[PDB]
């Protein structure tokens, strides 16, 4: 069961709302993260003018619809939107949906009652991304065409001046596309059209009124060298970094040398400053390789072409396999299960071990069936192979396996573990995962949502 990957279960098209009769798109999708464990998962899909809110329920009937639309909100202003994140009312604990777009304001909607909670005003240009802090659900970050990040607090003490921090200075010089929080809520990644990925350290914010935001002028890590193109999606994976750029058809996994979230958070005066204008990378963290970062792996995502503003999403949850998902610009949805890499390495080591210890004469038995490495040994008086490794073995088979699972070349291309075709011409913009990982929703152009499921309950 734990090795199951999703399959297409439901899809829908939301009526064109940017009329030209089909150039509307869903730009974002996000599952609500504050529901009690086991509750039916709920996501919001954000089009240019609407927020579409759906609950997903598993069905025993293959023909029944698991998706039901429980709230539909229109931005009755002039803004076209493309970013969303969830927060909560700090008094009532009701869900709050934040929505931001090309006029540079964040609208915070009380979604169960269908009213506005508040607006967050201050940015000098359109907002292209929002993220909520995992450590504090009242803290949200916005990334803007004005080249800054603003950090906002919905806590009651900050009602009269809710911008608690600005990430400014000269770290970025063009429109930002992507902002992300570390799980500890104190490190922020930003990136965009200037091809710079920046890591910033947030101070602690006082639990009282702040007449002005704290301004941070210097990131603690900065580099334009991981990609050679505009960067439109970044995220932490634990302490590791995932990012992708336009024209590269990869998602890059990499790390900052010397960065660990077990260490104390550095203060703003620890940041490096641009003393030398020829350095395209600088880092507070530099302690092994002499460099300040190490490229680790590249997930192959073919046929993104020249498209940008396409985002991936990792499902990372205790006790479940981590799954990377991404849809390209030619009607494909890709999945990688990061737990397959280790089990394939273990199996390749078990194979080569017994090949020497027995002069090339070993037997290979699939896992998953009723046979143990014990019952199998009772027969010949033996290597266990994961059942998902599918064809000694032919060179073409070993080549196919290494393309999917070999992690030995940082500039290699790791082929998707599952590749699902999409009918029609479709460009993926965003991926979201339900809390229990049984639903994966891809949204994109044509106002289309693709809903994938595993661990279903359908029967006959």
């Amino acid at each position: 069961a734990e090795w199951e990957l999703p399959r297409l279960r439901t899809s829908f098209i939301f009526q064109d709302d940017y009329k030209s009769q089909d150039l509307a798109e869903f730009f974002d999708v996000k599952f609500y993260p504050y529901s009690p464990p086991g509750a039916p998962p709920v996501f919001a899909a954000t089009s240019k003018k609407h927020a579409v809110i759906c609950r997903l329920t598993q069905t025993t009937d293959k023909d029944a619809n698991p998706c039901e639309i429980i709230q539909l909100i229109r931005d009755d202003g002039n803004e076209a939107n493309c970013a969303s994140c969830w927060s909560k009312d700090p008094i009532t604990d009701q869900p709050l949906l934040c929505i931001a777009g090309n006029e540079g304001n964040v609208k915070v909607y009380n979604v169960t009652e269908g009213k506005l909670y508040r607006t967050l005003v201050g940015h000098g240009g359109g907002i292209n991304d929002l993220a909520t802090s995992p450590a504090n659900p009242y803290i949200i970050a916005s990334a803007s065409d004005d080249t800054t990040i603003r950090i906002w607090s919905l806590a009651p003490e900050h009602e009269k001046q809710p911008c608690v921090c600005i990430l400014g200075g000269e770290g970025h010089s063009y429109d930002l596309l992507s902002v992300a929080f570390h799980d500890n809520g104190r490190y922020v990644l930003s990136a965009g059209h200037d091809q710079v990925i920046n890591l910033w350290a947030l101070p602690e914010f006082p639990n009282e009124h702040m007449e002005i935001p704290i301004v941070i002028y210097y990131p603690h890590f900065s580099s334009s060298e991981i990609h050679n193109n505009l960067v439109d999606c970044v995220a932490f994976y634990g302490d590791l970094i995932l990012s992708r750029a336009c024209h590269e058809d990869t998602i890059v996994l990499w790390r900052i040398e010397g960065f660990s979230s077990d260490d104390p958070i550095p203060g703003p005066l620890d940041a490096p400053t641009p003393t030398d204008m020829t350095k395209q990378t600088r880092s507070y963290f530099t302690p092994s390789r002499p460099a300040m970062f190490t490229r680790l792996a590249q997930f192959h995502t073919p046929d993104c072409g020249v498209q940008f503003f396409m985002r991936f999403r990792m499902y990372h949850v205790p006790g479940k396999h981590p799954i990377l998902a991404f849809a390209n610009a030619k009607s494909k949805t890709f999945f990688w299960d990061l737990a397959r890499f280790g089990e394939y390495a273990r199996f390749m080591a078990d194979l080569k071990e017994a090949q020497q210890s027995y002069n090339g004469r070993v037997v290979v038995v699939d896992q998953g069936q009723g046979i143990s490495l014990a019952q199998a040994q009772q027969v010949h008086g033996v290597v266990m192979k994961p059942a998902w490794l599918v064809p000694g073995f032919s060179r073409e088979t070993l080549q196919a396996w290494a393309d999917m699972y070999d992690l030995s070349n940082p500039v290699g291309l790791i082929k998707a573990h599952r590749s699902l075709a999409i009918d029609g011409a479709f460009v993926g913009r965003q991926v979201g995962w339900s809390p229990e990982g049984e639903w994966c929703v891809v949204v994109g152009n044509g106002n289309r949502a693709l809903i994938y499921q595993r661990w279903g309950k359908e029967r006959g």
């Binding site: 150039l23 798109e25 193109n229 505009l230 336009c246 024209h247 072409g305 020249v306 498209q307 940008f308 503003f309 610009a329 011409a425 460009v427 152009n445 044509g446």
Partner: peptide, 7 residues
């Protein structure tokens, strides 16, 4: 050249 909207 990079492109943002759908093709």
């Amino acid at each position: 050249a990079a492109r943002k909207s759908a093709p």
